[PDB]
Amino acid sequence: SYIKPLPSGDFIVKALTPVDAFNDFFGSEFSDEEFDTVGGLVMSAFGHLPKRNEVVELGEFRFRVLNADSRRVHLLRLSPL
């Protein structure tokens, strides 16, 4: 549902993924008090609505925008650092 494994070892992650769920999958420690969803985590780090192929590094991961529309991020590619 939330994640799709890729054979590179990266993941496609839905922006609506709860941060609690994300930390459980990936071993990260992002704040579930400060953030509700991965897209919120990413949009805060950008400080704007990103376009496809914008990238941010947070924690031990790289987040690359695969899909966003005019309102929100939809899909991120997650790579380990």
XYZ file of N, CA and C in Angstrom:
243
model
N 0.846 -1.238 0.000
C 0.000 0.000 0.000
C 0.863 1.262 0.000
N 1.556 1.532 1.093
C 2.314 2.783 1.169
C 3.615 2.780 0.376
N 4.306 1.627 0.320
C 5.634 1.546 -0.289
C 5.674 0.475 -1.386
N 6.553 0.686 -2.352
C 6.805 -0.249 -3.401
C 8.313 -0.417 -3.545
N 8.836 -1.599 -3.256
C 10.252 -1.864 -3.404
C 10.693 -1.894 -4.856
N 11.850 -1.322 -5.092
C 12.470 -1.307 -6.386
C 13.743 -2.157 -6.351
N 14.109 -2.764 -7.511
C 15.237 -3.681 -7.528
C 16.622 -3.042 -7.354
N 16.695 -1.705 -7.476
C 17.852 -0.926 -7.109
C 18.084 -0.907 -5.590
N 17.076 -1.272 -4.793
C 17.105 -1.120 -3.366
C 16.408 0.099 -2.834
N 15.992 0.967 -3.749
C 15.184 2.144 -3.439
C 13.714 1.743 -3.324
N 12.900 2.720 -2.951
C 11.491 2.495 -2.721
C 10.723 3.622 -3.365
N 9.542 3.313 -3.878
C 8.518 4.335 -4.145
C 7.656 4.446 -2.876
N 7.527 5.650 -2.318
C 6.791 5.919 -1.098
C 5.677 6.896 -1.362
N 4.434 6.547 -0.997
C 3.321 7.496 -1.120
C 3.477 8.662 -0.128
N 3.189 9.893 -0.592
C 3.253 11.058 0.279
C 2.299 10.996 1.507
N 1.188 10.299 1.366
C 0.202 10.104 2.436
C 0.627 9.108 3.515
N 1.715 8.355 3.295
C 2.325 7.488 4.359
C 2.509 8.216 5.677
N 1.855 7.746 6.749
C 2.105 8.248 8.059
C 3.564 8.191 8.422
N 4.066 9.220 9.064
C 5.437 9.188 9.523
C 5.729 7.970 10.465
N 4.782 7.596 11.347
C 4.923 6.407 12.240
C 5.157 5.113 11.439
N 4.365 4.961 10.380
C 4.502 3.863 9.399
C 5.820 3.906 8.689
N 6.236 5.091 8.207
C 7.519 5.217 7.536
C 8.712 4.790 8.440
N 8.769 5.301 9.669
C 9.829 4.952 10.619
C 9.870 3.435 10.864
N 8.704 2.818 10.917
C 8.615 1.352 11.064
C 9.167 0.549 9.902
N 8.947 1.031 8.698
C 9.467 0.412 7.513
C 10.948 0.624 7.405
N 11.402 1.851 7.625
C 12.771 2.196 7.257
C 13.781 2.419 8.397
N 13.351 2.341 9.637
C 14.271 2.419 10.736
C 14.664 3.824 11.089
N 13.997 4.795 10.479
C 14.227 6.221 10.712
C 13.587 6.666 12.009
N 13.858 7.890 12.388
C 13.332 8.448 13.646
C 12.760 9.867 13.433
N 12.058 10.054 12.332
C 11.385 11.322 12.037
C 10.299 11.547 13.073
N 10.059 12.787 13.445
C 9.096 13.095 14.491
C 7.622 12.955 14.095
N 6.955 11.965 14.679
C 5.508 11.709 14.491
C 4.647 12.692 15.268
N 5.282 13.461 16.164
C 4.671 14.626 16.840
C 4.694 15.910 15.988
N 5.804 16.128 15.275
C 5.973 17.324 14.421
C 5.367 17.101 13.057
N 5.331 15.855 12.577
C 4.850 15.603 11.200
C 3.811 14.563 11.096
N 2.780 14.735 10.264
C 1.784 13.654 10.119
C 2.147 12.691 9.021
N 2.571 13.201 7.873
C 2.815 12.340 6.710
C 4.145 12.674 6.072
N 4.662 11.721 5.303
C 5.905 11.887 4.549
C 5.862 13.133 3.673
N 4.734 13.382 3.022
C 4.626 14.581 2.160
C 4.768 15.868 2.966
N 4.135 15.935 4.127
C 4.413 17.005 5.105
C 5.869 17.148 5.540
N 6.556 16.042 5.797
C 7.972 16.056 6.121
C 8.742 16.679 4.962
N 8.494 16.184 3.747
C 9.204 16.656 2.553
C 8.859 18.122 2.213
N 7.573 18.482 2.277
C 7.138 19.846 1.882
C 7.709 20.836 2.853
N 7.852 20.462 4.106
C 8.470 21.370 5.054
C 9.946 21.586 4.750
N 10.652 20.519 4.396
C 12.065 20.573 4.031
C 12.334 21.394 2.777
N 11.478 21.301 1.776
C 11.519 22.183 0.597
C 11.062 23.614 0.944
N 10.004 23.753 1.754
C 9.392 25.063 2.014
C 8.562 25.608 0.878
N 8.325 24.785 -0.147
C 7.499 25.113 -1.320
C 6.934 23.806 -1.835
N 5.957 23.878 -2.752
C 5.474 22.708 -3.494
C 6.493 22.330 -4.575
N 7.162 21.171 -4.414
C 8.164 20.827 -5.380
C 7.554 20.266 -6.653
N 8.378 20.286 -7.689
C 8.089 19.655 -8.957
C 8.820 18.359 -9.005
N 8.382 17.494 -9.897
C 9.115 16.300 -10.218
C 10.623 16.555 -10.361
N 11.384 15.643 -9.767
C 12.844 15.536 -9.783
C 13.563 16.466 -8.805
N 12.830 17.294 -8.068
C 13.409 17.968 -6.911
C 13.797 16.900 -5.870
N 14.918 17.126 -5.198
C 15.458 16.193 -4.234
C 15.759 16.889 -2.896
N 15.469 16.221 -1.775
C 15.932 16.666 -0.459
C 16.512 15.460 0.289
N 17.574 15.697 1.039
C 18.128 14.725 1.961
C 17.732 15.065 3.384
N 17.180 14.053 4.023
C 16.720 14.121 5.378
C 17.072 12.810 6.097
N 17.737 12.936 7.241
C 18.119 11.771 8.011
C 19.115 11.074 7.159
N 18.930 9.761 7.056
C 19.813 8.864 6.298
C 19.234 8.517 4.941
N 18.343 9.368 4.447
C 17.686 9.143 3.169
C 17.675 10.326 2.264
N 17.695 10.023 0.966
C 17.397 10.944 -0.095
C 15.940 10.727 -0.589
N 15.211 11.845 -0.723
C 13.844 11.864 -1.201
C 13.778 12.649 -2.507
N 13.442 11.955 -3.589
C 13.316 12.562 -4.922
C 11.843 12.561 -5.306
N 11.311 13.717 -5.702
C 9.921 13.819 -6.109
C 9.694 13.114 -7.447
N 8.895 12.060 -7.442
C 8.484 11.392 -8.706
C 7.202 11.921 -9.280
N 6.292 12.348 -8.413
C 4.977 12.834 -8.836
C 4.439 13.849 -7.864
N 4.085 15.009 -8.380
C 3.341 15.994 -7.600
C 2.371 16.634 -8.552
N 1.247 17.114 -8.032
C 0.357 17.945 -8.829
C 0.399 19.426 -8.380
N -0.641 20.190 -8.669
C -0.677 21.639 -8.361
C -0.917 21.975 -6.879
N -1.260 20.985 -6.080
C -1.556 21.118 -4.651
C -0.597 20.318 -3.716
N -0.177 19.099 -4.110
C 0.506 18.254 -3.219
C 1.507 17.306 -3.878
N 2.410 16.751 -3.071
C 3.316 15.686 -3.497
C 2.504 14.415 -3.465
N 2.761 13.549 -4.407
C 2.104 12.249 -4.407
C 3.045 11.053 -4.182
N 4.184 11.025 -4.858
C 5.089 9.893 -4.815
C 6.522 10.402 -4.714
N 7.309 9.755 -3.845
C 8.702 10.033 -3.606
C 9.458 8.773 -3.943
N 10.645 8.893 -4.507
C 11.609 7.822 -4.526
C 12.580 7.993 -3.365
N 12.654 6.987 -2.538
C 13.511 6.969 -1.343
C 14.776 6.185 -1.612
N 15.945 6.777 -1.438
C 17.249 6.115 -1.617
C 17.980 6.224 -0.259
N 18.666 5.154 0.209
C 19.524 5.354 1.400
C 20.742 6.230 1.140
N 21.211 7.026 2.100
C 22.434 7.819 1.842
C 23.778 7.027 1.785
